[PDB]
Amino acid sequence: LKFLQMALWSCTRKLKAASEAPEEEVSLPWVHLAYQRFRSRLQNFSRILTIYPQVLHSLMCEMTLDAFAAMACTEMLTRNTLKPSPQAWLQLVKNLSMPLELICSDEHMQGSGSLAQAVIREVRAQWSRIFSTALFVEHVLLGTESRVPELQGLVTEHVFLLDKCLRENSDVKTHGPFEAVMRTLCECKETASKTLSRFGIQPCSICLGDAKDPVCLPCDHVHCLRCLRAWFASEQMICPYCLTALPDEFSPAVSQAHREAIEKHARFRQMCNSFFVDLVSTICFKDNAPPEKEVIESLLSLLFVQEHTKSLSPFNDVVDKTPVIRSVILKLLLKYSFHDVKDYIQEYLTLLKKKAFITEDKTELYMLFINCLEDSILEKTSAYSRNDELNHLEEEGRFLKAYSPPANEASVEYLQEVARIR
Amino acid sequence: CNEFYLKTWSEWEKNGTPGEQRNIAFNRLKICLQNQEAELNLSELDLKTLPDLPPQITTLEIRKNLLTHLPDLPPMLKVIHAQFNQLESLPALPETLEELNAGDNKIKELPFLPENLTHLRVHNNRLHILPLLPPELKLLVVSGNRLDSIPPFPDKLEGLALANNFIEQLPELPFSMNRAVLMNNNLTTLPESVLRLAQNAFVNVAGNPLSGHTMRTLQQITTGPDYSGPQIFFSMG
Amino acid sequence: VISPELEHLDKTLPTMNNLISQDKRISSNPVAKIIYGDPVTFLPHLPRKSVVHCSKIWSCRKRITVEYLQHIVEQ
Ligand SMILES: [Zn+2]
Ligand SMILES: [Zn+2]
């Protein structure tokens, strides 16, 4: 109650200071006006303290208590990482996300002074870091617990290493933090692979995937049974990866230890991939400003193995046997204004179409773009107000008036015209 | 120096961290040193570092350990089976090296291959380019690497493996060949000479984006049974 | 009884669409040729140069809604 008094008092002082004239006396009416103007900020502060009352102890002309509460929370989360238990910390992080992200919203803090802005500048780095770590927990740690508990301790350690690689600069929309997170996730995967099998885990030297129905040998290299059946043709049962001297009487079978190991590493890779996808979507592709050039270039370089396509992933160990195309990064980039991202999208289209994954009759690929572009517009348009809806309809009329027409191919501006016209 | 060699091994032993069956290693090393056995073993003992081991050995298994680096290799250590160490690169290969296996290591560049290297196995390293090959290289296994180019092949390239690499074009495989494996490379086109080989060479090119016309060419040539060439394969499933 | 039928609509609906579109009652109508087939066969004015001047890029599309999501979840 004292802190809410201090907040509404500072709001009232600020509001009265703009009374068109000196503020000789602060009467009661202004208290209602301040409440009406700063209602959301105060309610959010109350919610914060309800979620994490301890913040009070951390606290002990301008409205700043909400930002100080947010800073206290991010500190009593960076220090209380995974306490009392990973689920309770994750759940606290999650609950606070909404009010903290509100406080880190520029519209929510319209008119904020220089102190509030300076606080929020750092609160945003802290929150982005805390959220990256929370997603790493939620996906890799918790899942590791049930599916692959042998690794739960190692992932716990890497949780804190993630917090530290984001500590200084936690804006993963930049290059350094994004590359650092990727380095961390690759080191975690490699170490987990070494844990699940101290001979490691390597893919079938025949199919270059992980050895479905694993068949180990006196040299411990792993292959698939079906691959060894096809391999067993004649005079060439001796492994390729090793050229071992084969006692011709050898006849293989399934070694359980490796199938369980591979299952564990596949669950691990799936969780790390889900973490990277969720980080990109929630953190990297969040702002009302598009990420830098180097981050997007790196993402597009990852989607293609040097070509073969794969799901959005930092690991060069999963691949779509057939050249599958998926809409993820297109849907993310289109969140922003097409005018900024068009060159990224055309580079993506040309890089797919560079005889890399598609050959001809690409009418279905273009429909993917056409639908993604249409989604962006629908996504934006459903946000518009009714007066904004009428203005938009006028702008579309003016575009239809302005539109007038190379062949044998399309471009992302042309496909965007097609989407808009549709 | 035998006293100093086992002494240094006991000294590294005092560094014995969890998992390291250094006791078993130390007995094996000392017996070999005093009996001057031509062979040593260190397999599966989860070692992370190697002191200098007896010189007069001509064979060694250090597989399934966790080393990240090797000391000088004895001049006589002809035969190494070092599969699954964590070596980030290979120190000096001695004069008489006749066989090496370096599977699942972390090497990225090899030292020079001696003249007597009748066999090499360096699978699953992270190499990008290979040193020169000797004329007597009866075997090269370089699969698992990231090689974008491949140096010439010697007189007697009997055995070859190249899977998981990035080789795009292959030097001429002479009649010395009897067992070729060349899958999942960057192969643009590979010569017809692979046909001239004997009637018993296994030749696989699966997983490659080879010239569709080159495959159709090789079918046209082989289905013209006039050739007494080897057994050639292109994919399985 | 019904669920088995709805499960297979992806297959069963193209069959009925074809049988209707190919009927003499309809196949001589241009609107049907526009809805079901490719009008390029019977419209000469239609450009054919740019991949964007195809028939599918100018085809219908699944309107995303809450109810469609609900159905998909149920499935
Ligand atoms: Zn396989
Ligand atoms: Zn082997």
Numbering used by the authors:
A (entry chain A): 3784 to 3843, 3854 to 4099, 4112 to 4210, 4217 to 4233
B (entry chain B): 37 to 273
C (entry chain A): 4684 to 4758
Tell me, in the authors' exact words, what the paper reports:
Here, we show that the enterobacterium Shigella flexneri actively antagonizes LPS ubiquitylation through IpaH1.4, a secreted effector protein with ubiquitin E3 ligase activity. To understand how IpaH1.4 recognizes RNF213, we determined the cryogenic electron microscopy structure of the IpaH1.4–RNF213 complex. The specificity of the interaction is achieved through the leucine-rich repeat of IpaH1.4, which binds the RING domain of RNF213 by hijacking the conserved RING interface required for binding to ubiquitin-charged E2 enzymes. The cryo-EM maps show that the LRR domains of IpaH1.4/2.5 interact with the RING domain of RNF213, whereas the unstructured N termini and the catalytic NEL domains of IpaH1.4/2.5 remain unresolved. Binding is mediated by the canonical concave substrate-binding side of the LRR, involving an extensive interaction interface spanning from strand β2 to β7. Substitutions of key interfacial residues, including L4036E in RNF213 and K100A, F120E, R215A, V217E and F238D in IpaH1.4 abolished or reduced binding between RNF213 and IpaH1.4. While WT IpaH1.4 effectively degraded RNF213, neither IpaH1.4-F238D nor IpaH1.4-R215A;V217E did so, similarly to catalytically inactive IpaH1.4-C368A. However, the respective RING domains bind the IpaH LRR in different orientations, with Zn2+ sites I and II of the RNF213 RING domain aligning with sites II and I of the LUBAC RING1 domain, respectively, when the structures of the two complexes are aligned by the IpaH1.4 LRR.
We recently discovered that the initial step of ubiquitin coat formation on cytosol-exposed Salmonella enterica serovar Typhimurium (Salmonella Typhimurium) is catalyzed by the E3 ligase RNF213, which ubiquitylates bacterial lipopolysaccharide (LPS) in the first example of ubiquitylation targeting a nonproteinaceous substrate. Shigella flexneri is an example of a cytosol-dwelling Gram-negative bacterium that has evolved a plethora of mechanisms to avoid clearance by cell-autonomous immunity, including antibacterial autophagy, to establish its replicative niche in the cytosol. IpaH proteins comprise a short unstructured N terminus, a leucine-rich repeat (LRR) mediating substrate recognition, and a C-terminal so-called ‘novel E3 ligase’ (NEL) domain. Lastly, to gain molecular insights into the interaction between IpaH1.4/2.5 and RNF213, we determined the structures of human RNF213 bound to IpaH1.4/2.5 using cryo-EM.
